[model samples]
Target: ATDRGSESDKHFRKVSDKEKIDQLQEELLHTQLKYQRILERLEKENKELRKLVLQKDDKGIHHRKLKKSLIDMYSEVLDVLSDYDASYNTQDHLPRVVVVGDQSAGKTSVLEMIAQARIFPRGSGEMMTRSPVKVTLSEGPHHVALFKDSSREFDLTKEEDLAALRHEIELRMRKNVKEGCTVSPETISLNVKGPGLQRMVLVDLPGVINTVTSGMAPDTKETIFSISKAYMQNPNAIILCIQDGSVDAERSIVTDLVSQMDPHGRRTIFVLTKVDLAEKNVASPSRIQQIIEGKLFPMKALGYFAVVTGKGNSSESIEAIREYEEEFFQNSKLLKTSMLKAHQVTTRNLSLAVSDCFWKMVRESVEQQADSFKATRFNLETEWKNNYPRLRELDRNELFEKAKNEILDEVISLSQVTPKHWEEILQQSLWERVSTHVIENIYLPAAQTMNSGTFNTTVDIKLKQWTDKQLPNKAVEVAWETLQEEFSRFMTEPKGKEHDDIFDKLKEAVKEESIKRHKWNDFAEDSLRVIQHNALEDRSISDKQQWDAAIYFMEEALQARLKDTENAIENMVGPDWKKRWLYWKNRTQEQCVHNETKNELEKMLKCNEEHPAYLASDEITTVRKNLESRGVEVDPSLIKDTWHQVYRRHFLKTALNHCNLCRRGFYYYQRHFVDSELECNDVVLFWRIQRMLAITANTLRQQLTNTEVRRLEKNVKEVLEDFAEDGEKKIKLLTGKRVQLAEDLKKVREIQEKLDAFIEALHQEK
Candidate 1:
């Protein structure tokens, strides 16, 4: 019996263990199935991506094949991007070289040497007797000719006919030659093109400085500007003409011309003409070379190259010039260095600019998002309280004074005159030194007399009263009374025109107050807060956890409000509501705030729909309706009260038009004759006020839609990205090169030190 009972217990235990194992196996199988499903999805996605990549590559290949034909077809687009008037892909399109210089600076002589022709009749005493003449290469010689009209070409073989040909060419070409025209009667086509060498065309221009006094026609400033623009646009490189020695006028002209002609200043080579003449002077060639290398070389307005045109007249001179040319070509170090530097700087700056633009977009986007959130919050709060108790009590003038005072404080704080003591510079001498001596020596002493202890004390007391008592009380009272009347009219819908008039009056009153109170320092700050609140700001926070988790709570709130508003509009006013909504929406979203508060205030005086102040307050009720669907905590009564307050403050007849503080401050300063000396103080006040105005304007602009906010946010983000990219590019160009060069230099120095040490040790051993 005991054996049978033990067997039964063992069997039960075994059964229980098998059941547990079976369950575990089933669970593992399910998990494996899920894993396979995930793998399959990944594979499908990968296959799709591969197919897309191949398609893109195929398109790219096809596009490249048709590039030439496409460019030919779309010639206009190609022309816009081309550097020269003509586009040439063939070898025949070699660049042209133009040499220009002053007349007495040896331009004609240089040309005579190059052409190997007695074109100028051998300056019978360093004076040329003709205009520019072109020398064309013949079989073993050359021919001198002149351009007649646009279509006609003439040659001059005789000295007698030279003057007539020169005048004709000058008249036709409008060439500004310092000497009288003397065209040579000859014509020959030069065979300068070679199989491998680049083809070249050369032209000689009039000397810029010498033309002024040498009977040369003057070029209009506009013509010069146009010529420079065209020349820079051309693909050919420029060779600046200069004399062998010092000439201040020449240097100044060169520098100024280069700056104006090539704003970007690229691909330029300087040619120091008449080197032989300089060598013939008292200064030795070697000494002159030293001077040029040390002093002239460092000027670096453009890259430098020297040519001895006078050398072309003598075999010895030719040989010397050849040696210098050969040395330049063999080394080619300067050209390579300049090209590399320019390329690097350009690439870096371009990259940085792109990045800066991106970052600016990003910052703007963030700001937009914040604004949307605030707008949504305001709307939700208003919707929750259907009936506004404050709206009913239209004649309650008690709180009107308080609200007015608050508004006045905000305005004054944002104004330029109230905060009078915040000076940027500590020492008066700093400004005095930079300013005119009359102010420093004469005005300052006289001003100091008025800045006495007794006078200052009295002024301070008066200023305080003007700001705290007179300005605030007067401004608030006027605004509050005006706002009350406007609200009453709007609520009753008495006469549509009357309501409109009240709105207009309210706007005008506020504008007047703004201008009047422009002297207060804290005005800008207050204005910013008020404007921002009106445009976008959340009155309350709902669902703490959700708010905390949100990436941009302000933006989220705005989006929520917009979505709710759209839905409500669709439900109540039909789908056609979108059209009207869109029109009004755009109007509201427009940024009307100016960079300067003073300007903004002045703008308020104009009774135009485009005014920023008018648009800021127009859509408050609509926004409130939309935001109510979202969870927002705002007192309906408070919104109503605020609206009434705005109306009363703005819509009054014969209301206080100016800020009391500004009026009194301006009067006192002008009266005391201390205004001129306190210019810095005025500036500080203006800046402070401007800041406030900016904030207010921004706030008002932000009260549009969720989508609008998002758009703005995206723009800001893009701007920020651009900024960051620019910074990165600068780092790559400046920092990377600097670091690499520094490291390489350090390594070289270390090697030299080691070699020196080794040599010293060997000497000691010997």
Candidate 2:
């Protein structure tokens, strides 16, 4: 019965163990599948992110290329046209007059007045009478073309010959119109000539706004295009026609057309059409002028003009027309003045555009450089994180100290080479030629090559250029070599000082300290022995018994004392152990050194009577005297005192306290200052050596931390998580900005088109 029970128990135990194993296996499989899915998702996301980054990079490159092409083209065009004097040269040709206005703003009537042609019957329903008619002079050839839609008919016009009245209009109109559309069949012809007028083409543009509503055909896209080309290519004079009074519709149309015609609104001349009809219903010319000025000019969307079209032969109407003509002439003169100003502005803008293009290229290049650097940094950081545990375990401080000591020793050896004859000493040392060569060849090339796409790279190059001029040749190369050697040594050597002497001393000190703190571990057996002997002396017993009793007593005492000693050592070391001690000590020492140096430097730079502040104060006093000469009641003392304060506060304070943060101590200021100074020195040395290098303080800090394997592993995981979140936010912001810029560019293009139409219509009216 007992055997059977025992067997049952053993069988049950085996079954239970198998079940547990099966459950664990199942769980592991599930866990692995879940982790695999997560990894796949992450990989997919990373690929998409990489693709987006690549696309953005390519787009930026393309934009830069386009900008460069445009800049080059503009420069070539300007260079080709530099000697062409098109302005103020009427002998070359009559200024092209573009008469532009809305539909039936009496645009056709205005054209007849200018040409003195009774070609079109009064009250004719021919909205524009025909396409734009070019009238040169009486007894000269007259050209007539049809105006259809908003645009002229191109096919018919293209086939027409120059001498034929209809043919001339067709040929000219076809060339002027944009693609698509037929020219209107109705046309008008006139012959009139003005002094110095060579090619006086009148563009009778279709009425804007109500053309579609008034049963007049819409201007074809081609016609608008043709008209736009004429004005854009050779817009010598602009005659903008507006209704006498400002109506919402008129104002809106004028504003819109003017904006489209000339985005800058620089050289436009406003001509108020239908003033005769407006006076019949409204007030006098003075009141009309007040209204136009108040309502139109303030809007800045349209210019000012006043002309009476339906007055016929009435004295008041004729007088008003004469006044209007006089004003229009004056405004025309103003337009010429404005054109000169616009040309000047355009030239300035062209220069600015060239500068902007160059800057844009620089910006893109900088961004690319930054991205590359960031990627490299990311890789380095990852590697550092991976190896951090091992690095942290290493004695980095000891290694750095050794390298530093070696460099100092080398510097001392080089110093010893200095001779009484400086030039002779330089000639004997390999440093001189090596330094110059390094500065010219190695350093310069490195600077040029080391992320030349970055602002920092350019800065480094400039600094190197300056330093090469400042320092003795050999000294520069030698110093560069020393720095390079130290860096190399640090990477290759174990975590201990490279200088044998310093390493030996450091190792010895560490050993001595280790022994003093934990020497009790070695003497535990002896301590037990002493305790046992004391116990035996206190209590009498047989020899064997006494030995056993003493051994027990000694063991207890030794164990207790060892625990107490370990506790004491732990208390002294604290949680951060050696790091806390080293950090605090280095920081304190650096602060002390910096403060002392700063105080000494300040004393050396003490102000004297010849200081700029004193001179500035005196100058202010003289200015006050001059003001007093003009009876301005100036106070010289007050002015001088104010000037003195300004000089002291603005100049002296700024110049002297350049490194205020370094001079002051915050929680971690000491640590940051020491690190910053070290980085700055390295950068300076790189420049001195004529090497192309961009070593940021941040980069150096990251590098230093990465070298310590333990430190990297301890913190990198958390940092990476934070960085991923930040990257997402930056992507969103950049995308939004790009979209906004595209929208703005579209609006700018639309406005430019309207300006062209308004100008063309104005010239037709004239």
The whole-model lDDT of each prediction reads 0.33, 0.36
Candidate 2, residue 203: Cα displacement in angstroms equals 3.2
Clashes of 2: 59
Give all TM-scores, in the order shown.
0.23, 0.23
RMSD of 1: 37.1
lDDT by residue for model 2 (301-364), tens: 2244444454443112222454564454344332343321222111122223223333343233
Name the weakest run of 10 consecutive residues (lDDT summed) in model 2. 690-699
**Model 1 misplaced stretches (Cα beyond 4 Å):** 1-94, 118-199, 210-229, 244-252, 259-266, 279-282, 285-287, 290-766
- Per residue, candidate 1 scores C-alpha lDDT tens digits across 442-558 of 222222232344333443344343334333333233333332332233223434443322123223333343333222223433443344233223322234342232213222322
